[PDB]
Subunit: 71 residues, 2 copies
């Protein structure tokens, strides 16, 4: 990230542009807090993100958006 005049100064003759667009994600992550860590969130005071996954080890579409990628 920089200011506009420095962007111009950089793209003038120092850096070499590669592309004008890029495919980027178009969605978010998501946490739910359901299942077994719900009662741990209510009865006791703790809750782990991947509870159903730590228990087992204890025994999308994108979009082509214009940008200025330099190498």
């Amino acid at each position: 990230v920089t200011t506009a005049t420095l962007k111009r100064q950089l793209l003038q003759g120092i850096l070499q542009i590669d592309d004008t667009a890029a495919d980027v994600p178009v969605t978010y992550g998501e946490m739910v807090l359901q299942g077994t860590n719900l009662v741990t969130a209510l009865v006791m005071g703790k809750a782990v993100r991947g509870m159903d996954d730590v228990a087992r080890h204890l025994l999308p579409v994108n979009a082509r958006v214009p940008a200025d990628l330099v190498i």
Copy 2:
């Protein structure tokens, strides 16, 4: 519960005996702490 003297004194004529044979269980219970309660006893420090 009492002392043998008081037990004899009661059995003499005051109390009214009901039986001579009873039925006691021949087992205990059990707590195991396995599974969905084990992990919470290892990651955090509580279990139910």
